[PDB]
Amino acid sequence: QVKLEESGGGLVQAGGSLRLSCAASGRTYSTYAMGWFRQTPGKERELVAAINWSGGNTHYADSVKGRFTISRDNAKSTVYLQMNSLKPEDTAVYYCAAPKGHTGDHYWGPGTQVTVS
């Protein structure tokens, strides 16, 4: 099965920026769409941003539009989430995800803490 490897994140002051990365490990020109969900205590995971296999189509949650940008290094099967103008409400665990076929279910990375002070 596809393995998703995450890096980035950490603690940042409000107004600051972080850049998350997720790689479909060992894959070259992977055909998986990739993106991030985030989760806070007591709530379900919520889709933040996603990008298709080619990098030509993206999706953003309304709450992050104009602040977060998802991009893709297609050869390296790696996506990046540039998180600018961070707000306290952005504090969450961010999980990389790829679709399980066409089913609407997902493969998951391990999760990355983003904490905005």
Numbering used by the authors: 1 to 117
What did the original publication write about this model?
VHH R419 has a melting temperate of 66 °C and was found to be a monomer in solution. The protein crystallized in space group P6522 and the structure was solved by molecular replacement to a resolution of 1.5 Å. Crystals from the robot screen diffracted to a resolution of 1.5 Å, and the structure was readily solved by molecular replacement. The paratope of R419 is flat in shape, with a radius of 23 Å, which falls within the normal distribution of VHH paratope radii of 15–25 Å. The CDR2 loop of R419 is 10 amino acids long, and falls within cluster 2, which is the most common canonical structure observed in camelid VHH. CDR3 is 11 amino acids long, which is within the range falls within the median loop range of 7–16 residues found within 86% of antibody structures. A percent recovery of 82% (± 2%) was calculated from four experiments. These results suggest that R419 displays superior biophysical properties in terms of reversible folding and aggregation resistance. However, a recent survey of 70 camel and llama VHH found that aggregation resistance and reversible folding were very rare, with only 1–5% of antibodies reversibly folding. Interestingly, R419 contains none of the factors correlated with the propensity of VHH to reversibly fold, such as an usually long CDR3 loop (see below), or the presence of a non-canonical disulfide bond. The structure presented here may be useful for homology modeling of similar VHH or given the protein’s high expression yield, mid-range thermal stability, reversible folding lacking in significant aggregation and ease of crystallization, R419 may be a valuable tool for CDR scaffolding or as the basis of a novel semi-synthetic phage display library for VHH discovery.
The variable domain of these Camelidae antibodies can be cloned, resulting in the smallest known functional antigen-binding unit—the VHH (also called nanobodies, single domain antibodies, or sdAb). VHH antibody fragments are small (13–15 kDa), heat stable, readily produced in E. coli and display distinct antigen-binding properties compared to traditional antibody fragments. The VHH R419 was originally isolated from a pre-immune phage display library to bind the Listeria surface antigen Internalin B. VHH R419 was later found to be non-functional as it was unable to bind InlB or inhibit Listeria invasion in vitro. Here we report the structure and biophysical characterization of VHH R419 for its potential future value in homology modeling of other more therapeutically relevant VHH.
